[PDB]
Amino acid sequence: GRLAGKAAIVTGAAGGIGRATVEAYLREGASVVAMDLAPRLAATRYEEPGAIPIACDLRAAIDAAMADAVARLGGLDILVAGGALKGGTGNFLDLSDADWDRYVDVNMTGTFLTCRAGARAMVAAGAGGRSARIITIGSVNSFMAEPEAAAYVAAKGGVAMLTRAMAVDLARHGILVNMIAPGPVDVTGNNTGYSEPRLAEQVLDEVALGRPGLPEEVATAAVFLAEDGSSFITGSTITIDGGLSAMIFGGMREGRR
Amino acid sequence: GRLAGKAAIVTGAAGGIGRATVEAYLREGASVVAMDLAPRLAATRYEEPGAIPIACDLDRAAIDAAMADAVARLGGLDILVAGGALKGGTGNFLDLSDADWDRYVDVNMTGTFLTCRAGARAMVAAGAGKDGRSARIITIGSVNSFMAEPEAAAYVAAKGGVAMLTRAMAVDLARHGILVNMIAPGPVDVTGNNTGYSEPRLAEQVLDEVALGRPGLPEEVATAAVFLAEDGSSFITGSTITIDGGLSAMIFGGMREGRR
Amino acid sequence: GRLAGKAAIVTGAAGGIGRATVEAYLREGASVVAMDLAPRLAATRYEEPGAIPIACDLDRAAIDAAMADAVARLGGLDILVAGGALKGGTGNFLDLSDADWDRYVDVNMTGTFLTCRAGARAMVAAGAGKDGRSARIITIGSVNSFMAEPEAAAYVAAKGGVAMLTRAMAVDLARHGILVNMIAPGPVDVTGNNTGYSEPRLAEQVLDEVALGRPGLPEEVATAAVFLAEDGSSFITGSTITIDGGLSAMIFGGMREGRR
Amino acid sequence: GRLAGKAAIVTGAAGGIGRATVEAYLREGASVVAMDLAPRLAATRYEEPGAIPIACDLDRAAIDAAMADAVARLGGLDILVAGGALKGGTGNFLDLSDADWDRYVDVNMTGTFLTCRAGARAMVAAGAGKDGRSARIITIGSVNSFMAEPEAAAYVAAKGGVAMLTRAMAVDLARHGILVNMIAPGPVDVTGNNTGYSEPRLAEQVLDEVALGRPGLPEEVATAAVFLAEDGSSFITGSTITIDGGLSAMIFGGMREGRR
Ligand SMILES: CC(=O)N[C@H]1[C@@H](O)[C@H](O)[C@@H](CO)O[C@@H]1O
Numbered sequence A: 001g002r003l004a005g006k007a008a009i010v011t012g013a014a015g016g017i018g019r020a021t022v023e024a025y026l027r028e029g030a031s032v033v034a035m036d037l038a039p040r041l042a043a044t045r046y047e048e049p050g051a052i053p054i055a056c057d058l059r060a061a062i063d064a065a066m067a068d069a070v071a072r073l074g075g076l077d078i079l080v081a082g083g084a085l086k087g088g089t090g091n092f093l094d095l096s097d098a099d100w101d102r103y104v105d106v107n108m109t110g111t112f113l114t115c116r117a118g119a120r121a122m123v124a125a126g127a128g129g130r131s132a133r134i135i136t137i138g139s140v141n142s143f144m145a146e147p148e149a150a151a152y153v154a155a156k157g158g159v160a161m162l163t164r165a166m167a168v169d170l171a172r173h174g175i176l177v178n179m180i181a182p183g184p185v186d187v188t189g190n191n192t193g194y195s196e197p198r199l200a201e202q203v204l205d206e207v208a209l210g211r212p213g214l215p216e217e218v219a220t221a222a223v224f225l226a227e228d229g230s231s232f233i234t235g236s237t238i239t240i241d242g243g244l245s246a247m248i249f250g251g252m253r254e255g256r257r
Numbered sequence B, C, D: 001g002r003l004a005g006k007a008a009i010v011t012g013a014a015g016g017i018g019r020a021t022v023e024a025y026l027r028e029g030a031s032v033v034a035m036d037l038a039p040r041l042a043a044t045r046y047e048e049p050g051a052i053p054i055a056c057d058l059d060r061a062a063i064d065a066a067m068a069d070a071v072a073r074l075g076g077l078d079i080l081v082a083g084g085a086l087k088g089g090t091g092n093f094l095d096l097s098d099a100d101w102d103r104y105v106d107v108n109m110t111g112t113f114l115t116c117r118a119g120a121r122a123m124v125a126a127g128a129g130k131d132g133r134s135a136r137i138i139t140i141g142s143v144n145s146f147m148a149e150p151e152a153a154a155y156v157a158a159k160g161g162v163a164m165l166t167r168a169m170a171v172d173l174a175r176h177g178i179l180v181n182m183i184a185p186g187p188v189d190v191t192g193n194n195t196g197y198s199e200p201r202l203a204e205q206v207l208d209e210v211a212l213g214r215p216g217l218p219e220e221v222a223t224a225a226v227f228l229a230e231d232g233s234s235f236i237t238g239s240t241i242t243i244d245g246g247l248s249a250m251i252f253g254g255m256r257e258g259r260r
């Protein structure tokens, strides 16, 4: 396997993308801690065996969970920071302090705290001929805004520049740092995530491939960015969006018109 | 003047860029509130007359109070320039403390959010759009909103936050007659002394990395704040004007003829 | 006027954006050559007086001849706006012919290169930088310089070409006192008739994809050509000013309140 | 192997990146045509067996002939890597000749267009999509697709062209079951000798501007060509994978701890 013998922590590991990443990592020979909220971990099953579940709460909690995870793995080669609150709130005019703080604190500051803890553990465990790997999960919303979700969109721009600042500062310490930017991803397991009629029409217009992605289609990039061969890739984004961010006036194309 | 009769609030108005913007706005016929920390306002003079100083503190209670007072004194609000910002690095990301992280995110990202939400609500209350013309929000980000300097992860992250906040604001506020854009400065000498980038290793890297081979002046950034606030810029929203002497356009600038 | 005493060439000067730029430049005190095809110049009127018409054809021989004549009549060159462009799509990439490819690349990419090389040489010959101020090259790209419309691969490719040409020119010409920037318009109605984007499916997609919910006017683009040509923009080079009503800032605009 | 049973054409297959890609593709179970100039193919050896060499001249007649022959021998086409490219600078933009311009645009932009149009038509003819899996076009651009090096305006312009071509292809070919992406390498040492970036001023600027402080190896780029060609990458189209050791992510790298 392409990750044979590597120690990995995946946060948000109960959710769609996090879950698909745990499974792809186990399948490629890694030892994997799956970190998420206690209830969620309780309620999930993985199609691959070997996952070490560890409950956490995306500051004291984060440090405790990360220390425990590194203790059980005997080190740390790979961090996938997949923990994230999703969803919109309404127009920016009515955006409350509580909604702002929740998205910024959970998504931006939570990812910072997790990645600082991970990076320090990687250095302590001797990162660097080969390099440790930090992988953040951002969004096409790290670059272009959806309506009525200013707190989530701002946080994602924060995560994108955090990723680049981390790449720059951690290069000397033998750690490579990159982001994965998914477009729409159906996480229902049911093919019902984007089935609301107006939403399904706009997916057909705005995504070149005309559909949402599956979690497995994102996890594959997390393997690519964790493997030995990706040793000159740092500070970059792998965008996984079926052409969403590449296209304008996609509603006018042949086949849609 | 190009801003004749418009009501403007400029935050960070004691600092270099904020100060140059207050002066350009007064020169172009606007009524201007200059907002900054009380001490700083006390210690500044403007080369143009008419500025209405109002002390503020980018808590949240403070921001609302200062904005309400500002709008009361202006009799409305057409233009907001959110220039308040903590600058500077801390050290390597490995040693970045919770306190430094929180301070940059809370002051630069959340402070800009709180100021812009207050501003936007005041603009709507004052009838933005009603005569066919649009109110204007202008945020000051940085080349660090797109590319990272070393040893400043908290500041760089916050600037990415401000860049996407700006685009989310543009999208949501278009229906309310408000246009929202960012100005992204590269290196800007704010000493008044031409000494801001004079440390020898730094001055060498400015010569290599900036195509024009020098730092900018605050006035060179203020000119874009006038452009983005004027009536003519009525189809410009969700965009960035980058003011960096070619920094973000160039790679291997140390190899160019004249440098090598 | 903001361009008082400056010598400017505007190419594509019969067309919408080029015409609006000639008029804004005359209104701001510049001496202006209007360059375009002979027939088109014959068929156009400007709402401002003073334009020096000069026919051209974006041969290479033609471009040099026209530029030499223009510079002779102006007595120098401070400002070039390279607005000449073939627009329009062809069909799916699978069926894109050699003739359509060559025509879009040759006219839009190479024609902009030839015009800007001639302009830059003339600017240096006329002493660009000598008075501490810089000459200015302004290219007209598109949102298609960064994101692709369907069924227009030749036009889209050429626009990405022009975007990178612009940056390469910024880097190489900084030492010669010339600043180089691009303007990237989104949809612009050039009918004078409010009928450019009136086909019903198209009008629906403009409402969905443009935050301001309409096409721009030529005048809304020209305003940036003045900003980029004036003395105050002296630290701005290698950049893009995007004028698209939020098109490139937004995704899933069809879902927003007021549209769904 | 991850490409087991797939038919691939790799152009520029004698050169560093193209060679490393042919080898990685053979190692992952693909049948591979290696396309390049006749002399170069004659002079190269691959560390893996199975390559089908086919001479070509990125010569429009030549391209079609070589591609028809390649598809005939493979019995179809699942994967195209368009790696053919002229590299190198010329001098300042002011002195850039028509002949250098045309050679870079014609070989790098137009040659990539002709190759990819041929490839895409073959892929459709061979039934791309029928089994629910998609054919794959991979273009080799550069960090110069986005930011300019000095003294290489023709090469840089062409790379911006190839970047936007890639996106226009992604958009138009999605309905035909083909995914299209670019790989953007930073500095890559293609000497086999660790001498590519050894000139002292250059080596110094690589240390300053690349976060990893070195050039890449061809193998470090080829790995992304495998990723983009495999079945798992089925939601990735219109994108860029940048492989540059942090070059495009960083500013003022010369100031970082360990360098200053
Ligand atoms: C606001 C929000 O939570 N957006 C989701 C998803 O709903 C979107 O489809 C996707 C990008 O379109 O971003 C996100 O992953």
Ligand SMILES: CC(=O)N[C@H]1[C@@H](O)[C@H](O)[C@@H](CO)O[C@@H]1O
Residues within 6 Å of the ligand: B086, B087, B088, B089, B142, B143, B144, B149, B152, B155, B185, B186, B187, B188, D251, D252
């Ligand atoms: C970290 C920080 O505060 N950066 C400053 C300044 O020091 C830099 O020169 C400039 C970007 O280069 O950004 C900023 O305006």
Ligand SMILES: CC(=O)N[C@H]1[C@@H](O)[C@H](O)[C@@H](CO)O[C@@H]1O
Residues within 6 Å of the ligand: A248, A249, C086, C087, C088, C089, C142, C143, C144, C149, C152, C155, C185, C186, C187, C188
């Ligand atoms: C194919 C083409 O020429 N595109 C035009 C115009 O049709 C579009 O509306 C505009 C914005 O997409 O780009 C362009 O200026």
Ligand SMILES: CC(=O)N[C@H]1[C@@H](O)[C@H](O)[C@@H](CO)O[C@@H]1O
Residues within 6 Å of the ligand: B251, B252, D087, D088, D089, D142, D143, D144, D149, D152, D155, D185, D186, D187, D188
């Ligand atoms: C001039 C030129 O052809 N640029 C090449 C290469 O020489 C550079 O090292 C690389 C990184 O700048 O870009 C390119 O791939």
Ligand SMILES: OC[C@H]1O[C@H](O)[C@@H](O)[C@@H](O)[C@@H]1O
Residues within 6 Å of the ligand: B147, B208, B209, B210, B246, B247, B248, B249, B250, B251, B252, B253, D147, D209, D247, D248, D249, D250, D251, D252
């Ligand atoms: O010229 C300074 C330069 O720093 C880097 O090398 C790159 O990220 C460029 O984009 C930036 O412009």
